[PDB]
Design a binder for this molecule. Sequence first.
Ligand SMILES: Nc1ncnc2c1ncn2[C@@H]1O[C@H](COP(=O)(O)OP(=O)(O)OP(O)(O)=S)[C@@H](O)[C@H]1O
Ligand SMILES: Nc1ncnc2c1ncn2[C@@H]1O[C@H](COP(=O)(O)OP(=O)(O)OP(O)(O)=S)[C@@H](O)[C@H]1O
Ligand SMILES: Nc1ncnc2c1ncn2[C@@H]1O[C@H](COP(=O)(O)OP(=O)(O)OP(O)(O)=S)[C@@H](O)[C@H]1O
Ligand SMILES: Nc1ncnc2c1ncn2[C@@H]1O[C@H](COP(=O)(O)OP(=O)(O)OP(O)(O)=S)[C@@H](O)[C@H]1O
Ligand SMILES: [Ca+2]
Ligand SMILES: [Ca+2]
Ligand SMILES: [Ca+2]
Ligand SMILES: [Ca+2]
Lengths: 292, 292, 292, 292
Amino acid sequence: AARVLLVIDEPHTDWAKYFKGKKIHGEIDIKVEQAEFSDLNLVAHANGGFSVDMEVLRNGVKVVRSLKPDFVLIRQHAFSMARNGDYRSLVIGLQYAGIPSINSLHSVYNFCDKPWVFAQMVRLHKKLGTEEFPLINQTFYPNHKEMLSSTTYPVVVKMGHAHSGMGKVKVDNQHDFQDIASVVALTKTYATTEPFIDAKYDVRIQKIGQNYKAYMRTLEQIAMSDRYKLWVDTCSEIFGGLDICAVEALHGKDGRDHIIEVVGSSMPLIGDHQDEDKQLIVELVVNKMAQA
Amino acid sequence: AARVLLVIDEPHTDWAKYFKGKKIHGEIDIKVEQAEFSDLNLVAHANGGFSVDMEVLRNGVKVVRSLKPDFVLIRQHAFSMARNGDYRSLVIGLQYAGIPSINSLHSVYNFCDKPWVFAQMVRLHKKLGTEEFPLINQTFYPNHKEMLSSTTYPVVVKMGHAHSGMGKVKVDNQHDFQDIASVVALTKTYATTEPFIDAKYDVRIQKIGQNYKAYMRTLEQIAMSDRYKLWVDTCSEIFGGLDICAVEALHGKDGRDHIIEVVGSSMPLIGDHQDEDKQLIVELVVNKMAQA
Amino acid sequence: AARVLLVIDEPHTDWAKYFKGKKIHGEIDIKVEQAEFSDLNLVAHANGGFSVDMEVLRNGVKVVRSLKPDFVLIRQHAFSMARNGDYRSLVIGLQYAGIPSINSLHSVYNFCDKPWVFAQMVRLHKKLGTEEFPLINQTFYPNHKEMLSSTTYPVVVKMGHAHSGMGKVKVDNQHDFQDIASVVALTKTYATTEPFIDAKYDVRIQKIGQNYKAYMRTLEQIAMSDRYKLWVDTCSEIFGGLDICAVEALHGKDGRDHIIEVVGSSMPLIGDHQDEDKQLIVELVVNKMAQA
Amino acid sequence: AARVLLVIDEPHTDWAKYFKGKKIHGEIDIKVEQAEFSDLNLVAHANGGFSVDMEVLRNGVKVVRSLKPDFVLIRQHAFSMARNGDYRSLVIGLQYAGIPSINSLHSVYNFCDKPWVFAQMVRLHKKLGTEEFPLINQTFYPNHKEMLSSTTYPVVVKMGHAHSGMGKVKVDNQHDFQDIASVVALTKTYATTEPFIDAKYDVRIQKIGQNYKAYMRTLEQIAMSDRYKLWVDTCSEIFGGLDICAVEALHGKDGRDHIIEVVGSSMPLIGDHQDEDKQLIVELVVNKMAQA
Ligand SMILES: Nc1ncnc2c1ncn2[C@@H]1O[C@H](COP(=O)(O)OP(=O)(O)OP(O)(O)=S)[C@@H](O)[C@H]1O
Ligand SMILES: Nc1ncnc2c1ncn2[C@@H]1O[C@H](COP(=O)(O)OP(=O)(O)OP(O)(O)=S)[C@@H](O)[C@H]1O
Ligand SMILES: Nc1ncnc2c1ncn2[C@@H]1O[C@H](COP(=O)(O)OP(=O)(O)OP(O)(O)=S)[C@@H](O)[C@H]1O
Ligand SMILES: Nc1ncnc2c1ncn2[C@@H]1O[C@H](COP(=O)(O)OP(=O)(O)OP(O)(O)=S)[C@@H](O)[C@H]1O
Ligand SMILES: [Ca+2]
Ligand SMILES: [Ca+2]
Ligand SMILES: [Ca+2]
Ligand SMILES: [Ca+2]
């Protein structure tokens, strides 16, 4: 009998290919079903029954086919303040259905608010100190109301729950801040400001299972340090543990490091070792599927 | 030197009175500041600094005074789909500020979506079975789309994140379901349906710290059973543990029990033993404040 | 190369056979080394290096083959209050070497004192109550001194750390108790006494990974109940979790159940599903080796 | 009535004095009973009942006073490979009785084998690396057999479970090692060897609740660093958390640090802040008693 694995990722990565031939316990097979959040819906019952639905809008003359995932691999963000970018209810649905996931549905749900994720890093930074965990000094505003100034400009204003260079605005002076603050008013949501950094380079320390990779972009893969490993291990324990994650830090010309954030299972696969990470992810997923 | 405790509760319960005279370690005092979510705002910095602001709109000619809580006691819900009922960003803010809380800010944040909370109960029901944990068979719909019927009517449709008999609608037949489903469309959010229950009575098993109380409403305080205690202990471990919580179950005339939900630190204090529970809550809060 | 798995079990079970062909990630091979605690020895260094030297003196004087386990499966018992029965320092050694194990080395070490294990069950019985967890009312005596009388006869005296019918003695009266008490003096160790159960039949609820089996003896497999499953799940969480375990309970002639103990990874495989359980254990071990 | 706290410590510290006037919840009183492991005895029953009988033979033959601790504070060491040094069965007894403790009875029991405790530090050193956690490179020998040579001289041989300068021996050459190895044979127990550190000074980073203190000896208090704090926080999480602990490290003449061990609730109070730490311990104990 087989095992269905739903991979929530943009069409771009042919997951069925990578899971080709992998057998759970060396004998059971894995049917790989893949779709984006937008093309999915579901009904979950507390007694156990459920049904996920595929293709709200896509090729195969739409139609919409339901399946029953035994496991889910979420490679896509669940929240985005941009129109239609609200799949949080789908995550809740999957959790309600009791479907095992990577990363855990719990973490995926708690990753829906960036400052909520950053708040975890704040706790770790509090415990560890700047010498161990140089977390940029960000400021969180529940809403633009007391959003009045910035101790040092330029400052980087990150609005709502954004990603992909979006929601980011670099402010250079007081008068320009007040305008962006008024724009934050119209967004009817929270924002954060952080000192802008004159960066010599930036790093991203990733961890997939027990695998660590450090890349430097200015994309040169550099070597891991106990310091780097501390950053990522620390962050990998949040929301009960993150199977796939990375910590982005900026190394300023001044030689000071500043950790800006931690990303979950949606972490974009970068570098030369593309397929390599995809294989690691496959091994991890197959193994968790075997433990169900 | 003293300790400020912010209690987020409606003006109705004079908390300052109950904390009167209680001293941390038998010597430090507790200044009790109390406000509703609506009258509060804050700025939190990753370096540690922060400022909470009181009275967005209230007596004392408003003005707005800031304080610095050393601890928070959240006795109010953080989310409500009704207008202005969105303080989730305040919770995030408090967490960002690193302020200890009861219940934990983590739990308070995860309690913002009822079906997300119910999903935890589903896991426990899955593990334990109906003989140990008779959780009503609820159905979750991410959105009204496949919301087509109900195996048995009447059915109780609970819309969005509601509370206080609001968002609840008892549906008696198919045609009436389809209308409510169309109304769920306009709410642009999720809903749940569950078999309606012909109840002989209902129970609420509460747990405050190590104190358990069982009440029956039809408000008679009844005795605790190992069965009741199992229900509440089980639920008290979710989202990393809930210091104050209760499990509501309906006992149908048919002698079958059905657990409908678990409530957090906002759990309304009921019964005769009103002040009593308030004292227990005070002892718990003072003790957690001492461990900081 | 391949992956070495050391299985600490009597030679009476050919583990290499069961692991035959099983490949980690469907590719890496598993070399199965098997020996008995008595034939094992090692050295572990904090920098990481180590060696587990198997000394099987099977003809040819001192026969020693060095090996380096990647994982351990402990199916034999580590501590026994008898000659040639203390292999606790080997467990410590393996932990010191950092070798992954099933069950965990932590649990295997904490299972070295039966009443210490029973003490965990006492905590669970205190939380759950007799209705949920009917743990026999045993009495622990750190030594013979306080061992003056029993409040029930017959009584079953269990001396120190004994197993497989050893160290157990049923006393029928006061005079006979005082004699056994003087014998406990001579053991220079602790003892426990418990009411004797004139039992119709005894049950053993086992759990290997996510598999549950209930057997009755008077062997005959019976069906699992939520009650049975509660017993074993509860016990499976002790010492940080037990991958393989079982709960033994006696259903007296009184018509009620009595939990007498919980056994770890050394739990004897019984019934007709011996080989099936052996496979379940194999699948579990291979999977944990894959996560290492 | 009041609340009984049994403090297991040598009479050289008048605990009743420090707990004088301290009231649980500002109301309930604390009766402080204090004795030494040797003078203690008990009986514990699974149904809940128990008794801890203090036999202080201070003039007047057999002097016994029964008592029932509500909490225990273990400041004395439980296991010692010497005559009159095994009180492990008392710890088990207390756990069996369900009495709350500081440190936890679980940790006190797992601290009975130094290399078992060291094994935890080895795991942390493996995760963190020498840069973050410079744990001396110790070697564990389950027994004298494999104890053929050391890769560095001088070397420090620590026999079995010894403390307070006991069982430690510095060997300067091969011939002298073989003699000490033959002596380890006679102990019929395990031993460890570690490179000898010609040290300028040794540090001890302590943590009592949320208080950190660093002392240097050549005693002199020095300031805490994020590095120091990392060492102690890391160690404070072992065996489920240690309320009172310290990490001893030697800063050699080589110019680098070496962590040699972590001590539990029996950690000797040193420095000039002995009384301050005694108060910190008192505040911690009273608070945990309040949560019970
Ligand atoms: N505080 C800062 N100071 C200076 N440069 C910054 C700062 N924060 C971000 N940047 C740069 O802006 C890029 C994108 O902003 P991010 O905070 O990473 O948000 P994002 O929307 O996740 O963007 P991507 O997908 O990572 S490029 C980073 O990769 C940095 O090079
Ligand atoms: N499935 C059901 N079948 C029958 N009666 C129900 C059902 N669910 C709820 N009720 C009743 O409706 C009341 C309120 O609905 P709840 O689910 O408790 O929502 P709520 O908005 O939290 O309401 P309160 O504050 O507890 S009255 C309960 O106290 C029950 O008496
Ligand atoms: N209090 C008791 N009353 C009656 N029968 C008992 C009692 N304790 C043990 N027995 C029986 O004796 C068997 C063995 O004693 P246990 O306490 O289970 O330890 P053991 O001798 O190590 O067990 P095994 O199964 O032989 S390895 C049980 O399986 C019971 O059938
Ligand atoms: N490898 C070593 N090299 C050099 N000095 C050492 C070494 N091990 C221990 N020492 C010293 O010996 C002291 C005591 O040995 P420990 O391993 O700490 O055990 P101990 O004898 O129980 O300790 P205390 O503090 O006397 S209770 C340390 O505090 C060091 O100063
Ligand atoms: Ca980013
Ligand atoms: Ca309710
Ligand atoms: Ca047995
Ligand atoms: Ca020491």
